[PDB]
Amino acid sequence: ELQRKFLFDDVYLDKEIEKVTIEARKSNPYPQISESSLLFKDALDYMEKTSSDYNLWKLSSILFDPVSYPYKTDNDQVKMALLKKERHC
Amino acid sequence: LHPYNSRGLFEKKLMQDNKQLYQIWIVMVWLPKNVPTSKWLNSITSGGLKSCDLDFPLRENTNVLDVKDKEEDHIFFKYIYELILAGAIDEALEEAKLSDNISICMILCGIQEYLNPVIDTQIANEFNTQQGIKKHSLWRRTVYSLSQQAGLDPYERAIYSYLSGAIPN
């Protein structure tokens, strides 16, 4: 009940370890995660590219991972608007 | 000032960093009617009308609506030609609005460049909302097509010359 064709790449296991800060945990020695900054662009290179499965996973790449404007514009209200305007493009 | 701007801060810096153009601008700029508004009644009844707008006038004859506001497109525009060399265009907006026009008066809000708290940083503070057109150059070349439009009689267009820089019409 899960049959995604890009689970069968073990380098996609490894991409998900690198978008993750691995946590040396202190209640138990076993690994946890301190910070998941997991991308939904890590399956857009193993997925087929026609499908609203691709458009689904892309929509969360604009929304559920950030979008920002690179260089600082002079006022804070303006800086913040250009993250939302970039995301809007 | 510098780093990334709309078209609004460009224009300010232009005038800042020369002063013979800034004076040239100041020269040209330096040197009452009661109108109840509304249309579109009398038009459908004699013939066609079929859609309400002053763009019906532009698909064909300019006799198709009320013809005592056909009056106003000559006359109150003549008042407007005294006004624009008495300065401003927002003055001329307030008289365009008494001219029984209310979608051809959008063209005098068109003359504004984009002044915004999204793309200017010293015009983000005397405005906290979006103003003007950020397609102001496609506005300029499209209000310049009317300056030559030959369906437009001279008593409309001469200010549309002037809104894109004045050919002597």
Curated annotation (Swiss-Prot), chain A:
Topology of this chain in the membrane: Peripheral membrane protein
Source species, domain of life: Eukaryota
Subcellular location: Nucleus, Nuclear pore complex; Nucleus membrane
Name of protein: Nucleoporin NUP145C
Organism of this sequence: Saccharomyces cerevisiae (strain ATCC 204508 / S288c)
UniProtKB/Swiss-Prot annotation, chain B:
Function comment: Functions as a component of the nuclear pore complex (NPC). NPC components, collectively referred to as nucleoporins (NUPs), can play the role of both NPC structural components and of docking or interaction partners for transiently associated nuclear transport factors. NUP84 is involved in nuclear poly(A)+ RNA export, in NPC assembly and distribution, as well as in nuclear envelope organization.
Subcellular compartments: Nucleus, Nuclear pore complex; Nucleus membrane
Assembly notes: Component of the nuclear pore complex (NPC). NPC constitutes the exclusive means of nucleocytoplasmic transport. NPCs allow the passive diffusion of ions and small molecules and the active, nuclear transport receptor-mediated bidirectional transport of macromolecules such as proteins, RNAs, ribonucleoparticles (RNPs), and ribosomal subunits across the nuclear envelope. Due to its 8-fold rotational symmetry, all subunits are present with 8 copies or multiples thereof.
The keyword Coiled coil is annotated on this UniProt entry: yes
Name of protein: Nucleoporin NUP84
Gene Ontology cellular component terms for the protein in this record: chromosome, telomeric region; nuclear envelope; nuclear membrane; nuclear pore; nuclear pore outer ring
Recorded family membership: Belongs to the Nup84/Nup107 nucleoporin family.
Single GO BP term: protein import into nucleus
Domain of life: Eukaryota
Keywords: Coiled coil, Membrane, mRNA transport, Nuclear pore complex, Nucleus, Protein transport, Translocation, Transport
Residue range from the parent sequence: 96 to 273 of 726
GO molecular function: identical protein binding; structural constituent of nuclear pore
